[PDB]
Task: inverse folding
């Protein structure tokens, strides 16, 4: 509907089912979403974890080459530019299959890659066998008038990962994910706390429906600093569009002691 | 009602209003609660932050001597022994008024003090003016067949404080508190996450009603490892009695990186 008059930020989250090992199908879905989000006045689209090749870690390790990942990455840079919308995607990283991790990248509407991040907290034995964990803290960068940051999936369930972003100035944390198994506690209990305990907004974009032997939960959501859903989806495919509004835990935490007690 | 047949743990939480600077009145209330919890088969009673002198930090600094704190502490050890119930209380620490912090202590049913902890995360300028912050991590100790730990009030709102306890083996974290101002996000949003993200149980005992110029929220609650309230109170005085049931975030967290990124 009409954008708020001021200077403001409208984001979109793509929730959909990917087909394993079919990047032309999955990237076409991303392109469709990018066009629809831009038409609705969104300035950025967040898409889910490993959407381009499907959430199939062992198959990605066995079957998807670095040249194939690069071809999908160039296509995605192309969609950000061609649809004139900033885009956050998540693919395998650019190294060989035995060296790369799971990453998220943000390209601006000119297609320039502003930030790349490698998932630090791999989930379960198949991810750990298929991917190398990241060793770097989450990036934080100005975009659209706020400080954005990236994390991936299981990362957000650790308070330490969100705090690492908020410590570097993050105000809006964008999280591609792939969560199955009817795990309501992640978006229902953990996400609202990560928002409140840092005073930030988080956007969480999941797959939904049957894919690669799992049934994904959907439940994509944007949670504001009071832990309230600003918008949310259920279990069906959908494009969530949200207008964002413009204790001091982050000052008060005794970080020099906390660091010694983890 | 009848205790479960096995080896099991039944705890009680005292939620009530204290009178500022009137330890004979407030400690009598604790004694009443201890007797009632023991009669109902509870093995431990958790009571709220600074209940013995009321939640009045600046007045405690100005008016309550170390000899007066010690006299209340001996009375409380006496109630644990005489009512035959383990007791967790929270008083000013034992040093002079300008050196002491806010503490929580656990005495067993024999009146032996098993653990003492000094609140690390002071809340707001009046606490910071009246008390010295603690510098030690939360204690964790076997009692009743589980590993118990102590934190105080604002501590629990920092994920790092609960993680410090769970890292040392805590399974049941006991939290005297004093929270006013209709701050629903603490027990509604933060506590359930602290339980889920560590896989622990937390018990949270607040004041309620008008006291020292504030109106306390009540909302005392025991939350289990799925983030569900096992029992909970509203805004009126009450004695909550709960029978406790008998992802691996704690193994998976990359603590050596997290410690560098806080």
Result:
């Amino acid at each position: 509907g009409l954008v708020p008059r001021g200077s403001h930020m409208r984001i979109a989250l793509m929730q959909h089912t990917a087909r394993p090992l079919d990047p032309q199908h999955n990237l076409d879905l991303i392109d469709d979403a990018a066009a629809r989000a831009s038409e609705q006045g969104a300035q950025l689209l967040l898409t889910p974890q490993l959407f381009g090749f499907g959430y199939v870690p062992s198959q990605i390790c066995a079957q998807v080459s670095a040249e194939q990942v690069d071809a999908a990455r160039s296509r995605l840079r192309g969609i950000a530019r061609d649809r004139g919308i900033a885009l956050v995607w998540s693919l395998p990283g650019p190294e060989g299959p035995e060296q790369r991790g799971i990453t998220a990248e943000l390209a601006d509407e000119h297609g320039e890659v502003l930030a790349s991040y490698q998932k630090v907290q791999l989930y379960g034995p198949e991810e750990k066998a298929a991917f190398v964990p990241g060793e770097q803290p989450p990036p934080v960068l100005s975009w659209g008038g706020r400080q954005l940051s990236l994390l991936v999936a299981y990362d957000v369930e650790f308070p330490e990962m969100v705090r690492a972003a908020a410590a570097r100035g993050a105000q809006l944390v964008l999280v591609p994910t792939a969560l199955a198994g009817d795990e309501t506690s992640v978006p229902g209990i953990l996400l609202p706390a990560r928002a409140v305990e840092n005073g930030i907004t988080l956007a969480y974009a999941n797959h939904c429906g049957p894919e690669g032997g799992l049934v994904f939960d959907g439940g994509s959501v944007v949670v504001g600093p009071a832990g309230q859903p600003l918008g949310e989806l259920g279990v069906e495919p959908g494009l969530l569009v949200v207008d964002l509004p413009d204790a001091d835990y982050l000052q008060d935490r005794r970080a020099e002691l906390h660091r010694n007690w983890l």
About this structure: The two ends of chain B are 47 Å apart (CA to CA).
